[PDB]
């Protein structure tokens with residue numbers, strides 16, 4: 001009765017769209033975001049998710065676009081609603097700076113596998129949102145200084161965002 | 177840097193209280209709940225966390241007291257506020273039916289390692305709460321039918337809950353009428 005629907009992106013090869021089922025009742029809802037048996041097989045040989053992170057952001061925050069050459073991510077929204085965006089940031093890739101966007105909320109609980117070399121970003125449409133992502137990497141976590149950054153509104157990517165004036169960090173402004 | 181403070185409980189042998197650091201700014205906060213390196217080492221050799229669950233509950237929900245002899249859990253609240261309760265349900269333990277309570281919210285981001293053979297429960301004080309817990313087990317996941325349930329209001333445990341009138345499932349109500357039969361499989 002714990003189930004996953006696992007579909008590969010039609011737009012970006014190697015991006016996976018994972019949808020869990022849920023048990024809903026008078027108290028709320030219960031669901032499984034991840035099992036090693038269901039999801040780690042999607043990663044390359046020798047790699048498993050080993051790191052769980054939470055981001056709680058206020059309305060009209062954008063975070064991104066962030067990535068590095070080794071870190072795989074599995075991302076969703078576990079409270080509120082986001083626009084989740086994946087960008088192919090591999091400079092050798094024929095689909096370099098193509099993107100895909102997912103509107104994620106409790107009724108659309110897509111979970112996105114973001115490969116290494118892809119950029120990751122989200123926008124908060126709700127009053128606030130809690131972003132959940134898992135990381136898979138060998139050796140050390142790649143912190144912000146060693147990551148690449150693209151501007152949320154880079155004209156090459158041309159993302160359709162629901163904001164014309166987001167709340168950003170200095171990193172994400174420097175990128176613009 | 178990503179940091180953890182890890183303390184064993186002073187009350188219940190085997191329970192760990194894990195506290196992350198957070199980066200806070202104008203946008204909100206970022207934090208790490210788990211790394212294999214930091215936390216999987218607290219489990220038995222050969223066992224790792226391999227399952228992630230979310231429970232979103234409305235105000236005044238209780239869930240519990242649920243447990244099984246194989247499954248280790250790592251639990252916190254990632255939105256809202258709960259009263260998280262661990263019960264030692266190991267019948268051999270000197271602290272059998274003793275409990276520890278943690279009020280968990282964004283300013284008190286404790287993450288509780290609940291060992292196999294313990295009972296797990298929580299109550300939602302906020303308008304709603306999102307409960308996050310990881311599971312570590314060999315073999316198949318232990319679903320509701322193969323778990324034990326202790327009554328939320330069992331007077332041998334004597335949990336100080338903030339209400340006498342929580343919202344409960346049929347499973348958690350039925351436990352209040354089967355005290356003494358928690359182990360029946």
Ligand SMILES: Nc1nc2c(ncn2[C@@H]2O[C@H](COP(=O)(O)OP(=O)(O)O)[C@@H](O)[C@H]2O)c(=O)[nH]1
Pocket residue numbers: 001002003021022023030031032229231239240242319320345347
């Ligand atoms: N789809 C799905 N169903 C689940 C999951 N976890 C539990 N259930 C089902 O949800 C119901 C309640 O399970 P239980 O563990 O009693 O929930 P609790 O009372 O919140 O601990 C049972 O029917 C379970 O089979 C899950 O992760 N996914």
Ligand SMILES: Nc1nc2c(ncn2[C@@H]2O[C@H](COP(=O)(O)OP(=O)(O)O)[C@@H](O)[C@H]2O)c(=O)[nH]1
Pocket residue numbers: 053055063064066143144169171177178179197198199206207208
């Ligand atoms: N304590 C802690 N700091 C973090 C974590 N992740 C990122 N940071 C720090 O938070 C700040 C912003 O990081 P960045 O990756 O730009 O955050 P983003 O803008 O949300 O992607 C940087 O100083 C990071 O070192 C974490 O999990 N825990």
Ligand SMILES: [K+]
Pocket residue numbers: 040041042043044045046047048
């Ligand atoms: K793998």
Ligand SMILES: [K+]
Pocket residue numbers: 216217218219220221222223224
């Ligand atoms: K271990």
Ligand code: NA
Pocket residue numbers: 040041042043044045
């Ligand atoms: Na694989």
Ligand code: NA
Pocket residue numbers: 216217218219220221
């Ligand atoms: Na160990």
